[PDB]
mmCIF file of the C-alpha atoms, coordinates in Angstrom:
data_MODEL
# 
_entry.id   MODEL 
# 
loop_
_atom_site.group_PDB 
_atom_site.id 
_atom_site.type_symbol 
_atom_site.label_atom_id 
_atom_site.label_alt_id 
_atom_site.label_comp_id 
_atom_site.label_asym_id 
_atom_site.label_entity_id 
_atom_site.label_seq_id 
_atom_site.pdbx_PDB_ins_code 
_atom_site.Cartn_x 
_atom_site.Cartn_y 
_atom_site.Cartn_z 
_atom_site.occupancy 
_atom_site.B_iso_or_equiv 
_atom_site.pdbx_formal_charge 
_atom_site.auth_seq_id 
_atom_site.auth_comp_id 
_atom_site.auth_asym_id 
_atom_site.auth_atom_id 
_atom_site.pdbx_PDB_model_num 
ATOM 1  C CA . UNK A 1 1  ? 62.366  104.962 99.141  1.00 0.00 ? 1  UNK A CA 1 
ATOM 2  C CA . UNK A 1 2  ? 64.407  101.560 98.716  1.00 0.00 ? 2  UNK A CA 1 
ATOM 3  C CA . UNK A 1 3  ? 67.317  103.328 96.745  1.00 0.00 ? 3  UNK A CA 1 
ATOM 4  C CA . UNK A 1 4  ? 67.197  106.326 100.000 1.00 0.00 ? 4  UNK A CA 1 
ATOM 5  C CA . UNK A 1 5  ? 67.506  103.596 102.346 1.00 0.00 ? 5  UNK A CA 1 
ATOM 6  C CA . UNK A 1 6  ? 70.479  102.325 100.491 1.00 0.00 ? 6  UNK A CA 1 
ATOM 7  C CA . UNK A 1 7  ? 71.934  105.544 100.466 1.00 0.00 ? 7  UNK A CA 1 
ATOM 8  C CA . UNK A 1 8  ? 71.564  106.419 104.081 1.00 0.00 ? 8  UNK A CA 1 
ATOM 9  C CA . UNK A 1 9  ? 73.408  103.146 104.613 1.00 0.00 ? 9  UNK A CA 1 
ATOM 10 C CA . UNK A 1 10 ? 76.461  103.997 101.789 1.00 0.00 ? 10 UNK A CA 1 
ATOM 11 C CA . UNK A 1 11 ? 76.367  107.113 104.045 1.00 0.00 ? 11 UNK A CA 1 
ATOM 12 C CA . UNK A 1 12 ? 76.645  105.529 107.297 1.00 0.00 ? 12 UNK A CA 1 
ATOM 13 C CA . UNK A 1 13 ? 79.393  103.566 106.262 1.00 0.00 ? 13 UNK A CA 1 
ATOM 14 C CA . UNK A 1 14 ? 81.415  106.082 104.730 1.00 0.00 ? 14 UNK A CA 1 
ATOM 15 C CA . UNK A 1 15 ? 81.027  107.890 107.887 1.00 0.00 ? 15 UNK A CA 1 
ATOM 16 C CA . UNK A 1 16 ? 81.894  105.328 109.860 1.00 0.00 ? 16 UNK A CA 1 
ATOM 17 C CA . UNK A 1 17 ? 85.365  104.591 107.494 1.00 0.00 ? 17 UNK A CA 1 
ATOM 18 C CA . UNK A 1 18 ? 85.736  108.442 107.780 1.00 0.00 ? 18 UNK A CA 1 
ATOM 19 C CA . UNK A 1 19 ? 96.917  107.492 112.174 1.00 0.00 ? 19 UNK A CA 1 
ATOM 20 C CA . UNK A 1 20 ? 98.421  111.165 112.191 1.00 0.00 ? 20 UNK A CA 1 
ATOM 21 C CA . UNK A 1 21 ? 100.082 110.405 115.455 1.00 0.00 ? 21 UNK A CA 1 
ATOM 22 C CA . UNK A 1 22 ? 101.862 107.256 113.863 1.00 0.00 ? 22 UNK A CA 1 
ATOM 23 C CA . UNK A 1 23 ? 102.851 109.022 110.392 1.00 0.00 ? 23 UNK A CA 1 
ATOM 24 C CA . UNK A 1 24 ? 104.421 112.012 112.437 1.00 0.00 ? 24 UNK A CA 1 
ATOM 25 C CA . UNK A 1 25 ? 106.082 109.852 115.373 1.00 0.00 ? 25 UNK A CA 1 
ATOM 26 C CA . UNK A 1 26 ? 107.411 107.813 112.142 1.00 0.00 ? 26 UNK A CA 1 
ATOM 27 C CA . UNK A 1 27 ? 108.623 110.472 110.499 1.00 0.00 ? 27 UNK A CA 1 
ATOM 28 C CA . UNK A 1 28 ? 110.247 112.010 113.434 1.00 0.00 ? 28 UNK A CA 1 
ATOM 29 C CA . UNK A 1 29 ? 112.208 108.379 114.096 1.00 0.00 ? 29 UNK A CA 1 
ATOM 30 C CA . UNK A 1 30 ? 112.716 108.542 110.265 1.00 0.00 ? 30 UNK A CA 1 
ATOM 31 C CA . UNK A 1 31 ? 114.532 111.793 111.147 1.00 0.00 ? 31 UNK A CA 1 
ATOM 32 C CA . UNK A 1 32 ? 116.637 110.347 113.833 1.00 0.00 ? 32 UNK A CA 1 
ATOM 33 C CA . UNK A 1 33 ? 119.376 109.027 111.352 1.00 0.00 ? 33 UNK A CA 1 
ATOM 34 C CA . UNK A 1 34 ? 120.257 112.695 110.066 1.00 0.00 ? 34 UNK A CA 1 
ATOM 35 C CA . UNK A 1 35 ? 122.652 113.707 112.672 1.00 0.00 ? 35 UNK A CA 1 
ATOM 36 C CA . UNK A 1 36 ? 126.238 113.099 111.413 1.00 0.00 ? 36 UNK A CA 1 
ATOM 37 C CA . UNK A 1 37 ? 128.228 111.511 113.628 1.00 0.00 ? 37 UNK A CA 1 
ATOM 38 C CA . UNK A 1 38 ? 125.244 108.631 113.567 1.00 0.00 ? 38 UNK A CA 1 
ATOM 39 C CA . UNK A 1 39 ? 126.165 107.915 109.778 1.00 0.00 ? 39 UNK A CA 1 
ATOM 40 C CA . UNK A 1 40 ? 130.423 108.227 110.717 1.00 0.00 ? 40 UNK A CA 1 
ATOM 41 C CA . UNK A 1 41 ? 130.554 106.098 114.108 1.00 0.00 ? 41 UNK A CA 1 
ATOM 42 C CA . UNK A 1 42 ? 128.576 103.601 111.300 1.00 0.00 ? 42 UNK A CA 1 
ATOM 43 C CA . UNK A 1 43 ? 131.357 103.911 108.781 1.00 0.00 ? 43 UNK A CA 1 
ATOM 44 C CA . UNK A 1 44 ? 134.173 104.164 111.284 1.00 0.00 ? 44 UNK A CA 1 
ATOM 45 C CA . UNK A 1 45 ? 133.638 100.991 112.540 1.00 0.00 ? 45 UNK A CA 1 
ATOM 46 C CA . UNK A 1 46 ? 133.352 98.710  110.023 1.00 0.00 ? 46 UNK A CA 1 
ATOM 47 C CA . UNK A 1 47 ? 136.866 99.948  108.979 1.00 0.00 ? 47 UNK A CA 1 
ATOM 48 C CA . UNK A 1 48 ? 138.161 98.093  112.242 1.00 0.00 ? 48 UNK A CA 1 
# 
């Protein structure tokens, strides 16, 4: 009975510790710098 009650409240933790829209929106931004002319007009001007 003690080492149940212990359990039940390992369990209701876990469920309670049991984000997506950050990694995607993240990942998207990340995805932002592909487009070539980003990475040129940021190596054409430098060379001013």
């Amino acid at each position: 009975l003690i080492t149940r009650t212990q359990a039940v409240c390992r369990g209701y933790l876990m469920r309670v510790e049991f984000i997506f829209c950050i990694q995607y929106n993240v990942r998207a931004f990340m995805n932002v710098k592909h487009w070539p002319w980003m990475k040129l007009y940021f190596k054409i001007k430098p060379l001013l």
